Coordinates of C-alpha atoms (C1' of nucleotides) in Angstrom, one line a residue:
Chain A
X1 CA 0.0 0.0 0.0
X2 CA 1.4 3.4 -1.0
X3 CA 0.7 6.5 1.2
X4 CA -0.5 9.9 0.0
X5 CA 0.1 13.2 1.8
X6 CA -1.1 16.8 1.5
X7 CA 1.8 19.3 1.9
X8 CA 2.5 23.0 2.1
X9 CA 5.4 25.4 2.6
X10 CA 5.5 28.9 3.9
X11 CA 8.5 30.9 2.7
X12 CA 10.4 34.2 3.2
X13 CA 10.2 37.2 0.9
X14 CA 13.7 38.6 0.5
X15 CA 15.6 38.0 -2.8
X16 CA 18.9 37.9 -0.8
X17 CA 17.3 35.5 1.7
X18 CA 14.8 32.9 0.4
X19 CA 14.1 29.9 2.6
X20 CA 11.2 27.9 4.1
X21 CA 10.1 29.1 7.5
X22 CA 7.4 26.5 8.1
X23 CA 6.3 23.2 6.5
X24 CA 3.3 20.9 6.9
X25 CA 2.4 17.4 5.8
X26 CA -0.8 15.4 6.5
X27 CA -1.6 11.8 5.6
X28 CA -4.6 12.2 3.2
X29 CA -6.1 9.0 4.6
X30 CA -5.3 9.7 8.2
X31 CA -5.6 13.4 9.2
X32 CA -4.3 12.6 12.6
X33 CA -0.9 11.7 11.0
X34 CA 0.6 15.1 10.4
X35 CA 3.4 17.4 11.4
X36 CA 4.2 21.1 11.2
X37 CA 7.8 22.1 11.5
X38 CA 10.2 25.0 10.7
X39 CA 13.1 23.2 8.8
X40 CA 13.5 22.1 5.2
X41 CA 16.3 19.7 6.0
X42 CA 13.8 18.1 8.4
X43 CA 11.0 18.0 5.9
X44 CA 13.3 16.7 3.2
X45 CA 14.8 14.0 5.6
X46 CA 11.2 12.8 5.9
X47 CA 10.6 13.0 2.1
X48 CA 13.5 10.7 1.5
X49 CA 12.2 8.0 3.8
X50 CA 8.4 8.0 3.5
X51 CA 8.6 6.5 0.1
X52 CA 5.1 7.8 -0.7
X53 CA 3.2 10.1 -3.0
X54 CA 3.2 13.8 -2.0
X55 CA 1.0 16.7 -3.1
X56 CA 1.5 20.4 -3.0
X57 CA -1.0 22.9 -4.2
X58 CA 1.0 24.8 -6.9
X59 CA 3.9 22.5 -7.3
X60 CA 5.6 25.1 -9.5
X61 CA 6.2 27.0 -6.3
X62 CA 7.1 24.6 -3.5
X63 CA 8.9 22.7 -6.2
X64 CA 11.6 25.4 -6.8
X65 CA 12.5 25.0 -3.1
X66 CA 12.5 21.2 -3.3
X67 CA 14.8 21.1 -6.3
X68 CA 17.1 23.8 -4.8
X69 CA 17.6 21.4 -1.9
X70 CA 18.0 18.2 -3.9
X71 CA 20.7 19.9 -6.0
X72 CA 22.7 20.9 -2.9
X73 CA 22.3 17.5 -1.2
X74 CA 23.7 15.0 -3.6
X75 CA 20.9 14.6 -6.2
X76 CA 20.9 15.2 -9.9
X77 CA 18.3 15.3 -12.6
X78 CA 18.0 12.0 -14.4
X79 CA 15.3 10.6 -16.8
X80 CA 16.6 7.1 -16.2
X81 CA 15.6 6.7 -12.5
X82 CA 19.1 6.0 -11.1
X83 CA 19.8 6.1 -7.3
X84 CA 20.3 9.6 -5.9
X85 CA 18.7 11.3 -8.8
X86 CA 15.3 12.9 -9.4
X87 CA 13.2 12.9 -12.6
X88 CA 10.6 15.5 -13.5
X89 CA 7.7 16.1 -15.8
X90 CA 7.7 19.9 -16.4
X91 CA 6.1 21.2 -19.6
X92 CA 7.4 23.5 -22.3
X93 CA 5.1 26.1 -20.7
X94 CA 6.5 25.8 -17.2
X95 CA 3.7 23.8 -15.7
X96 CA 4.8 21.3 -13.1
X97 CA 3.3 17.8 -12.8
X98 CA 5.8 15.6 -11.0
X99 CA 9.1 15.3 -9.1
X100 CA 10.2 11.7 -8.6
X101 CA 13.0 11.3 -6.0
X102 CA 14.7 7.9 -6.4
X103 CA 16.9 6.5 -3.5
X104 CA 17.6 3.1 -4.9
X105 CA 16.1 -0.3 -5.5
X106 CA 15.2 -3.4 -3.4
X107 CA 15.2 -6.1 -6.0
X108 CA 13.2 -5.0 -9.1
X109 CA 11.2 -2.5 -7.1
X110 CA 12.0 1.2 -7.0
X111 CA 12.4 3.1 -3.7
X112 CA 11.2 6.7 -4.2
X113 CA 9.0 9.5 -3.2
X114 CA 6.9 11.2 -5.9
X115 CA 5.6 14.7 -5.6
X116 CA 2.6 15.9 -7.5
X117 CA 0.6 19.1 -8.1
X118 CA -2.9 19.0 -6.3
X119 CA -3.7 22.1 -8.3
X120 CA -3.7 19.8 -11.4
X121 CA -6.4 17.7 -9.8
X122 CA -8.2 20.5 -8.1
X123 CA -7.9 23.6 -10.3
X124 CA -9.0 26.3 -7.9
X125 CA -7.4 28.2 -5.0
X126 CA -7.6 26.3 -1.6
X127 CA -10.0 28.9 -0.1
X128 CA -12.5 28.2 -2.9
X129 CA -12.1 24.4 -2.7
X130 CA -13.1 24.8 1.0
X131 CA -16.2 26.9 0.3
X132 CA -17.4 24.7 -2.6
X133 CA -16.6 21.3 -1.1
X134 CA -18.2 22.4 2.3
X135 CA -15.0 21.9 4.2
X136 CA -13.7 23.9 7.3
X137 CA -11.7 27.0 6.2
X138 CA -10.3 29.7 8.5
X139 CA -10.9 33.3 7.5
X140 CA -7.8 35.5 6.9
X141 CA -4.2 34.4 6.2
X142 CA -0.7 34.3 7.5
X143 CA 1.0 37.7 7.6
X144 CA 3.2 37.4 4.5
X145 CA 5.4 40.5 4.9
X146 CA 6.6 40.0 8.5
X147 CA 10.2 39.7 9.7
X148 CA 11.2 36.0 10.0
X149 CA 14.9 35.3 10.6
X150 CA 16.4 31.8 10.8
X151 CA 14.9 30.0 13.8
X152 CA 11.8 32.0 13.7
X153 CA 9.3 30.1 15.8
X154 CA 5.9 29.4 14.2
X155 CA 3.1 31.0 16.3
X156 CA -0.1 29.2 17.4
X157 CA -2.2 31.1 14.8
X158 CA 0.2 30.2 11.9
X159 CA 0.2 26.5 12.9
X160 CA -3.6 26.9 12.7
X161 CA -3.5 28.3 9.2
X162 CA -0.9 25.8 8.0
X163 CA -2.7 22.8 9.4
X164 CA -6.0 24.0 7.9
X165 CA -4.6 24.5 4.3
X166 CA -3.1 21.0 4.2
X167 CA -6.3 19.5 5.7
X168 CA -8.6 21.3 3.3
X169 CA -6.7 19.7 0.4
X170 CA -6.3 16.3 2.3
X171 CA -10.1 16.0 2.7
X172 CA -10.7 17.1 -0.9
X173 CA -8.2 14.8 -2.5
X174 CA -9.6 11.9 -0.5
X175 CA -13.2 12.5 -1.6
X176 CA -12.0 12.6 -5.2
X177 CA -9.9 9.4 -4.8
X178 CA -13.0 7.8 -3.2
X179 CA -15.2 8.8 -6.1
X180 CA -12.9 6.8 -8.4
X181 CA -11.0 9.8 -9.8
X182 CA -7.5 8.6 -9.0
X183 CA -5.5 9.8 -12.0
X184 CA -2.9 12.6 -12.0
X185 CA -5.0 15.3 -13.5
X186 CA -8.7 16.4 -13.7
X187 CA -8.3 16.0 -17.4
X188 CA -6.9 12.5 -17.3
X189 CA -9.8 11.6 -15.0
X190 CA -12.4 12.8 -17.5
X191 CA -10.8 11.1 -20.5
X192 CA -10.4 7.8 -18.6
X193 CA -14.0 8.2 -17.4
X194 CA -15.1 8.7 -21.1
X195 CA -12.9 5.8 -22.3
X196 CA -14.4 3.6 -19.5
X197 CA -18.0 4.2 -20.8
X198 CA -17.3 3.6 -24.6
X199 CA -14.5 1.1 -23.8
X200 CA -10.9 1.2 -24.8
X201 CA -11.3 -1.2 -27.7
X202 CA -14.0 1.1 -29.3
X203 CA -12.1 4.3 -28.4
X204 CA -9.1 3.1 -30.5
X205 CA -11.2 2.3 -33.5
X206 CA -13.5 5.3 -33.4
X207 CA -10.6 7.7 -32.4
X208 CA -7.6 6.3 -34.4
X209 CA -4.0 7.6 -34.1
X210 CA -3.1 10.1 -36.8
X211 CA 0.5 10.5 -38.0
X212 CA 2.3 13.6 -36.6
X213 CA 2.1 15.2 -40.1
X214 CA -1.7 15.0 -40.4
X215 CA -2.2 16.0 -36.7
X216 CA -0.2 19.2 -37.3
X217 CA -2.4 20.0 -40.3
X218 CA -5.6 19.3 -38.4
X219 CA -4.1 21.6 -35.7
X220 CA -3.8 24.6 -38.0
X221 CA -7.7 24.6 -37.8
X222 CA -7.7 24.5 -34.0
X223 CA -8.8 27.8 -32.5
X224 CA -10.3 28.9 -29.2
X225 CA -12.9 31.4 -28.0
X226 CA -14.4 34.3 -30.0
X227 CA -13.4 37.5 -28.2
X228 CA -14.7 40.6 -29.8
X229 CA -15.5 44.2 -28.9
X230 CA -17.9 46.1 -31.2
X231 CA -15.6 49.1 -32.0
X232 CA -18.3 51.7 -31.8
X233 CA -18.5 51.1 -28.1
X234 CA -14.7 51.2 -27.6
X235 CA -13.5 53.4 -24.7
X236 CA -17.0 54.9 -24.4
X237 CA -19.0 54.9 -21.1
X238 CA -22.4 53.4 -22.0
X239 CA -25.6 53.2 -20.0
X240 CA -27.8 50.2 -19.3
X241 CA -27.1 46.7 -20.7
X242 CA -27.2 43.0 -20.0
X243 CA -25.1 39.8 -20.2
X244 CA -26.3 36.4 -21.4
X245 CA -24.0 33.3 -21.4
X246 CA -24.5 29.8 -22.6
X247 CA -25.1 27.0 -20.1
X248 CA -22.0 24.7 -20.3
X249 CA -20.8 25.8 -23.8
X250 CA -18.5 22.9 -24.6
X251 CA -20.4 20.0 -23.1
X252 CA -23.5 21.5 -24.8
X253 CA -21.8 21.1 -28.2
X254 CA -20.5 17.7 -27.3
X255 CA -24.0 16.5 -26.4
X256 CA -25.7 17.4 -29.7
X257 CA -23.5 18.8 -32.5
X258 CA -22.3 16.7 -35.5
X259 CA -18.8 15.8 -34.5
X260 CA -16.0 13.9 -36.3
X261 CA -14.6 10.4 -35.8
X262 CA -12.7 7.6 -37.5
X263 CA -9.9 7.4 -40.1
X264 CA -9.9 10.6 -42.2
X265 CA -9.6 10.6 -46.0
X266 CA -7.2 13.2 -47.5
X267 CA -8.3 15.2 -50.5
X268 CA -6.7 17.6 -52.9
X269 CA -8.5 20.8 -54.0
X270 CA -11.9 21.7 -52.8
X271 CA -13.9 19.2 -50.7
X272 CA -16.6 17.4 -52.6
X273 CA -19.8 16.7 -50.6
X274 CA -20.1 13.2 -49.1
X275 CA -22.8 11.9 -46.7
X276 CA -20.5 9.3 -45.2
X277 CA -17.8 11.9 -44.6
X278 CA -19.8 15.2 -44.1
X279 CA -17.3 17.1 -41.9
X280 CA -14.0 18.4 -43.3
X281 CA -11.1 20.7 -42.7
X282 CA -10.3 22.8 -45.8
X283 CA -7.0 24.7 -46.5
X284 CA -7.6 27.8 -48.6
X285 CA -6.0 31.0 -49.7
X286 CA -8.2 33.9 -50.4
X287 CA -9.2 37.6 -50.2
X288 CA -12.5 38.8 -48.5
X289 CA -14.8 41.6 -47.5
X290 CA -17.2 41.9 -44.5
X291 CA -20.8 42.4 -45.7
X292 CA -22.8 45.4 -44.2
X293 CA -24.8 44.4 -41.1
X294 CA -22.4 41.5 -40.1
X295 CA -20.0 40.9 -37.3
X296 CA -16.5 39.9 -38.5
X297 CA -15.3 36.4 -37.7
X298 CA -11.9 36.0 -39.5
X299 CA -8.9 36.3 -37.3
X300 CA -5.4 35.7 -38.9
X301 CA -2.5 34.8 -36.7
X302 CA 1.1 34.0 -37.6
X303 CA 1.3 36.3 -40.7
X304 CA 3.4 39.4 -41.3
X305 CA 0.2 41.3 -42.6
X306 CA -2.0 41.1 -39.4
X307 CA -2.3 41.7 -36.2
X308 CA -3.4 38.3 -35.0
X309 CA -6.0 39.6 -32.4
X310 CA -8.0 41.7 -34.8
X311 CA -11.2 40.4 -36.4
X312 CA -10.9 41.9 -39.9
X313 CA -13.4 44.0 -41.9
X314 CA -11.3 43.1 -45.0
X315 CA -8.2 41.2 -46.2
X316 CA -6.7 44.6 -47.2
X317 CA -5.2 43.7 -50.5
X318 CA -3.4 40.6 -49.2
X319 CA -3.9 36.8 -49.7
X320 CA -5.0 35.1 -46.6
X321 CA -3.8 31.6 -45.9
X322 CA -6.1 29.6 -43.6
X323 CA -7.1 26.1 -42.5
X324 CA -10.8 26.0 -41.6
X325 CA -13.4 23.5 -40.5
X326 CA -16.6 23.3 -42.5
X327 CA -18.3 25.0 -39.6
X328 CA -15.9 27.9 -39.7
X329 CA -16.1 28.2 -43.5
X330 CA -19.9 28.0 -43.6
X331 CA -20.2 30.9 -41.1
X332 CA -17.5 32.8 -42.9
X333 CA -19.2 32.4 -46.3
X334 CA -22.4 33.9 -44.7
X335 CA -20.7 36.9 -43.0
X336 CA -18.1 37.8 -45.7
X337 CA -17.8 38.0 -49.4
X338 CA -15.0 35.6 -50.1
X339 CA -13.3 36.0 -53.5
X340 CA -10.5 34.7 -55.6
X341 CA -10.5 31.5 -53.4
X342 CA -7.8 29.0 -54.0
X343 CA -8.8 25.6 -52.6
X344 CA -5.6 23.8 -51.8
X345 CA -6.3 20.6 -49.9
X346 CA -8.0 19.0 -46.9
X347 CA -9.1 16.0 -44.9
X348 CA -12.7 14.8 -44.6
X349 CA -14.2 12.9 -41.6
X350 CA -17.2 10.7 -41.0
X351 CA -19.4 12.2 -38.2
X352 CA -22.1 11.4 -35.6
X353 CA -24.0 13.0 -32.8
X354 CA -24.1 11.7 -29.2
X355 CA -20.6 10.2 -29.0
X356 CA -20.7 11.9 -25.5
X357 CA -24.4 11.3 -24.6
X358 CA -23.8 8.5 -22.0
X359 CA -20.9 10.3 -20.4
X360 CA -22.6 13.7 -20.2
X361 CA -26.0 12.5 -18.9
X362 CA -24.2 10.3 -16.3
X363 CA -22.3 13.1 -14.7
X364 CA -25.1 15.7 -15.3
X365 CA -27.3 13.4 -13.3
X366 CA -24.7 13.2 -10.6
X367 CA -24.5 17.0 -10.7
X368 CA -28.2 17.7 -10.5
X369 CA -28.7 15.3 -7.6
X370 CA -25.7 16.0 -5.4
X371 CA -24.5 18.8 -3.0
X372 CA -21.1 20.3 -2.4
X373 CA -18.0 18.2 -3.0
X374 CA -19.5 15.5 -5.3
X375 CA -21.4 18.2 -7.2
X376 CA -18.1 20.0 -7.9
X377 CA -16.3 16.8 -8.9
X378 CA -19.2 16.2 -11.3
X379 CA -18.7 19.7 -12.8
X380 CA -15.0 18.9 -13.0
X381 CA -15.5 15.8 -15.0
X382 CA -17.9 17.5 -17.4
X383 CA -15.8 20.5 -18.0
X384 CA -12.3 18.9 -18.3
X385 CA -13.0 16.4 -21.1
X386 CA -13.0 18.2 -24.4
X387 CA -9.6 19.9 -24.0
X388 CA -7.9 16.7 -24.1
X389 CA -8.7 15.3 -27.5
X390 CA -6.5 18.0 -29.1
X391 CA -3.5 17.3 -26.7
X392 CA -0.3 18.4 -28.5
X393 CA 1.6 15.3 -29.2
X394 CA 4.8 17.3 -28.7
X395 CA 5.7 16.6 -25.0
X396 CA 9.2 18.1 -25.1
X397 CA 9.9 18.8 -21.5
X398 CA 12.0 21.3 -19.3
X399 CA 14.9 20.0 -17.3
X400 CA 16.0 21.8 -14.1
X401 CA 19.5 22.6 -13.1
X402 CA 21.3 25.1 -10.8
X403 CA 22.6 28.1 -12.7
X404 CA 26.1 29.1 -11.5
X405 CA 24.4 32.0 -9.5
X406 CA 22.8 29.5 -7.1
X407 CA 19.3 29.9 -8.6
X408 CA 17.3 27.4 -10.6
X409 CA 17.4 27.5 -14.4
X410 CA 15.7 25.4 -17.1
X411 CA 16.8 23.9 -20.5
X412 CA 14.6 22.2 -23.1
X413 CA 15.3 18.5 -23.1
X414 CA 15.2 16.1 -26.1
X415 CA 12.3 16.2 -28.6
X416 CA 9.7 13.8 -27.2
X417 CA 6.6 12.8 -29.1
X418 CA 3.4 11.1 -27.7
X419 CA 0.6 9.6 -29.7
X420 CA -2.1 12.1 -30.9
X421 CA -5.4 11.7 -29.1
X422 CA -8.0 12.9 -31.6
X423 CA -7.3 16.5 -32.6
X424 CA -10.2 16.9 -35.1
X425 CA -12.7 16.4 -32.3
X426 CA -11.1 19.4 -30.6
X427 CA -11.2 21.5 -33.8
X428 CA -15.0 20.9 -34.2
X429 CA -16.0 21.3 -30.6
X430 CA -14.5 24.8 -30.3
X431 CA -15.7 25.5 -33.8
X432 CA -19.3 24.8 -32.7
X433 CA -18.9 27.0 -29.6
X434 CA -17.8 29.9 -31.7
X435 CA -20.7 29.4 -34.1
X436 CA -23.1 29.3 -31.2
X437 CA -21.8 32.6 -29.8
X438 CA -21.4 34.4 -33.1
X439 CA -24.8 33.6 -34.6
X440 CA -26.5 34.8 -31.3
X441 CA -24.4 38.0 -31.4
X442 CA -25.3 38.5 -35.1
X443 CA -29.0 37.9 -34.4
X444 CA -28.7 40.8 -31.9
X445 CA -26.4 42.8 -34.2
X446 CA -28.3 46.1 -33.5
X447 CA -27.5 45.7 -29.8
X448 CA -24.3 43.7 -29.4
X449 CA -21.4 45.3 -27.5
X450 CA -19.0 42.4 -26.7
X451 CA -18.5 38.6 -26.7
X452 CA -15.9 36.4 -25.0
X453 CA -16.2 32.7 -25.8
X454 CA -19.6 32.0 -24.3
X455 CA -21.0 35.4 -23.5
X456 CA -22.9 38.1 -25.4
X457 CA -23.1 41.7 -23.9
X458 CA -26.0 43.8 -25.1
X459 CA -27.2 47.4 -24.6
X460 CA -30.7 47.8 -23.0
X461 CA -32.4 45.6 -20.4
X462 CA -35.2 43.6 -22.2
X463 CA -34.6 40.2 -23.6
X464 CA -34.3 40.4 -27.4
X465 CA -37.1 38.6 -29.4
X466 CA -34.8 36.5 -31.8
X467 CA -33.1 35.1 -28.6
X468 CA -36.3 34.7 -26.5
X469 CA -36.8 31.0 -27.6
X470 CA -33.3 29.7 -26.7
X471 CA -33.1 31.5 -23.3
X472 CA -33.5 29.5 -20.1
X473 CA -31.4 29.8 -16.9
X474 CA -30.7 26.0 -16.6
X475 CA -31.1 24.0 -19.8
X476 CA -27.9 22.7 -21.4
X477 CA -26.7 24.8 -24.3
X478 CA -29.3 27.6 -23.9
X479 CA -28.6 31.2 -23.0
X480 CA -29.0 32.3 -19.4
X481 CA -29.6 36.0 -18.5
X482 CA -26.8 36.2 -15.8
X483 CA -26.7 39.9 -15.2
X484 CA -28.0 43.4 -16.0
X485 CA -25.8 46.6 -15.5
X486 CA -26.5 50.3 -14.9
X487 CA -23.5 51.5 -16.9
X488 CA -20.3 50.0 -18.4
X489 CA -17.0 50.9 -20.1
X490 CA -15.3 48.5 -22.5
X491 CA -11.7 49.5 -23.3
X492 CA -10.6 46.5 -25.5
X493 CA -10.6 42.7 -25.5
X494 CA -10.9 41.2 -22.0
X495 CA -10.8 44.7 -20.6
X496 CA -14.2 46.1 -19.2
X497 CA -16.0 47.3 -16.1
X498 CA -19.7 47.0 -15.2
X499 CA -21.9 48.4 -12.4
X500 CA -24.1 45.4 -11.9
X501 CA -27.7 45.6 -10.6
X502 CA -27.8 43.3 -7.5
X503 CA -30.4 42.5 -4.8
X504 CA -30.9 40.9 -1.4
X505 CA -32.2 37.3 -1.3
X506 CA -32.0 35.8 2.2
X507 CA -29.7 38.7 3.1
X508 CA -27.3 37.9 0.3
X509 CA -26.1 40.1 -2.5
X510 CA -27.3 38.3 -5.7
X511 CA -27.8 39.7 -9.3
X512 CA -31.1 41.5 -9.8
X513 CA -32.8 43.7 -12.4
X514 CA -33.6 47.4 -12.7
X515 CA -37.1 47.1 -11.4
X516 CA -35.7 45.1 -8.4
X517 CA -32.4 46.2 -7.2
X518 CA -31.3 47.2 -3.7
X519 CA -27.6 47.8 -4.5
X520 CA -24.9 48.2 -7.2
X521 CA -21.7 46.1 -7.4
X522 CA -18.6 47.3 -9.3
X523 CA -17.0 44.6 -11.4
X524 CA -13.6 44.7 -13.1
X525 CA -12.6 42.3 -15.9
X526 CA -9.2 43.0 -17.2
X527 CA -6.7 40.3 -18.4
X528 CA -3.4 40.5 -16.6
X529 CA -4.7 42.6 -13.7
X530 CA -4.3 40.9 -10.3
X531 CA -7.1 41.3 -7.7
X532 CA -5.3 43.9 -5.6
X533 CA -4.9 46.3 -8.5
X534 CA -8.6 45.9 -9.4
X535 CA -9.5 47.6 -6.1
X536 CA -7.7 50.8 -7.4
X537 CA -9.8 50.8 -10.5
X538 CA -12.7 53.3 -10.6
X539 CA -14.9 54.4 -13.5
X540 CA -13.0 57.6 -14.0
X541 CA -9.4 56.2 -14.1
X542 CA -10.1 53.0 -16.1
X543 CA -8.4 53.9 -19.3
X544 CA -5.2 53.5 -21.3
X545 CA -2.8 55.0 -18.9
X546 CA -3.9 53.4 -15.7
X547 CA -0.8 52.1 -13.9
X548 CA -0.1 50.6 -10.5
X549 CA 3.1 49.1 -9.1
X550 CA 1.3 46.4 -7.0
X551 CA 1.8 43.3 -9.1
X552 CA 3.5 40.1 -7.7
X553 CA 6.1 38.6 -10.1
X554 CA 7.7 35.3 -9.1
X555 CA 11.4 35.3 -9.7
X556 CA 14.0 32.4 -9.3
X557 CA 16.6 33.1 -6.7
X558 CA 19.2 31.0 -4.9
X559 CA 17.2 28.8 -2.6
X560 CA 13.8 29.0 -4.3
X561 CA 11.2 31.5 -5.6
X562 CA 10.3 34.9 -4.3
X563 CA 7.4 37.2 -5.2
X564 CA 8.7 40.6 -6.3
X565 CA 6.6 43.7 -6.9
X566 CA 6.0 44.7 -10.5
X567 CA 3.9 47.2 -12.4
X568 CA 0.7 46.7 -14.4
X569 CA -0.2 49.3 -17.0
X570 CA -2.9 49.5 -19.6
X571 CA -1.2 50.3 -22.9
Chain B
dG1 C1' 5.1 35.7 -36.3
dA2 C1' 8.8 33.7 -34.2
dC3 C1' 12.7 36.4 -26.8
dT4 C1' 11.2 34.9 -21.7
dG5 C1' 8.1 34.4 -18.0
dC6 C1' 4.5 35.5 -16.1
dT7 C1' -0.8 37.4 -15.4
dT8 C1' -6.4 36.9 -16.1
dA9 C1' -10.8 35.6 -19.1
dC10 C1' -13.1 32.0 -20.4
Chain C
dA1 C1' 6.3 5.9 -19.6
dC2 C1' 2.7 9.9 -16.6
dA3 C1' 1.5 15.3 -19.1
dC4 C1' -6.2 19.7 -21.4
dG5 C1' -6.2 24.4 -23.7
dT6 C1' -6.5 29.3 -26.6
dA7 C1' -6.6 33.9 -26.3
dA8 C1' -5.3 38.6 -25.1
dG9 C1' -1.7 41.3 -22.5
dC10 C1' 2.5 43.6 -19.6
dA11 C1' 7.5 44.1 -18.6
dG12 C1' 12.0 43.1 -18.7
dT13 C1' 16.7 41.0 -21.4
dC14 C1' 19.9 40.5 -24.8

DNA sequence: GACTGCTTAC
DNA sequence: ACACGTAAGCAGTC
């Protein structure tokens, strides 16, 4: 039997002086078995003997400290699992999944302690896990800036906070492991849950392995959310308005859209219609013009002519090279005039609906019928599945080492390649989401202000008639009226403020309407702006210019990581 | 269009 | 071996 522990560090804040001042571990399966202490050597002496699986929330962070120690106490990075070495899975993007510390072997069997990221299983802050999973959480936090020299003694209150953090996550992990969700990541749990229901044998045949060449081509057609500000509202304080968003955008598409499967057939030129293979990805080159009355939908990245975040009113005298799904292209043909179109090549796929039916209604049932923890875990299964079909088969890692200056650096290791899952499915799921949002926006063209992925922001407070049929606050894939606002200011993409109408229901501040409301609530959405800076935003100062030197930046230094204060400015 | 290394929005 | 993202954005290095 292999033991699991929930762990945490607290650490100092000086660049010149970065160390652990307290540590905690708790047996996930026996919360009475735990220890708080003030020494890394002591923690790490234990790490090297428990021969168990450890979890930290945000392994990226405690990890820098762990590897700084390992490197100064006789360990080296090795992918081959030798004695006195450590292996890691750290992605190209600097996301941390594992630290495997090998001590040796008894017979064939490895003797080691593996450290994981509980954030990868439970992707929220600890405070929120507590609230949502109905677990005990203390209000407030440890005083972060506070002088703590070597041999600082942990106070009773800090012991309290440290014990509570590790317990919140112990209790949560355990509920998850008990539910069957034992894999490394929330995403791995979903996909395994989905494979379980359709069976591995069928999965392999319905979702075959494409070559790296084809996968890369399918991937040129893989895009995310539609994020668009109607430019007539740009940097202009408006009055009343309202926000609708879809109920579970992605699962909604998975439940009922025509989605691709099986071994694709490659074609040259322009796709020719085929009932048996009715979905396709088409490579074209063309010019185009937005028609009057229509929202733009063509966004061109990775070219020296745009400006990859703009949705374009026109191709501006240049030939646009793009790989598109048939959903993209059908929308695009209806919003634009496309001309001088060169149809190069493409793949076509067979298709069906309800490949995800059994999965989705299983966990939706579990969601509708359960409270707190299990309810959350059921949301987690539903929402973590689709992202995972389009997994990049390039798993080239990052390898840690100590730079000559005592701090932790990173080099890219060898090219590694895993088998492609089923990237076309990812292409179409997100294609359908976009179509859903854009056609709703366009139906409300005379009122639209903004969209971001699953949201449409409209002027005025009455529900528009074209939308009235597909609006319901609960039904999957329908639009829910989630808020109404008194006034708003949209600066650019992912950058807006709203004064939301709220009201008191059971003494709680919950969204209301303009013939209801008891109160207003200021709300700041602004990518890259950390919550402390948001408090400084007001309606008057929220504009290109706004700048505050209050932004934490984590920097590598000898010993570990330290948050340093940086500036955030709207440019 | 292509640095690194990080943030939030969804 | 084990490993969901895309998108839009700021600041500092060389």
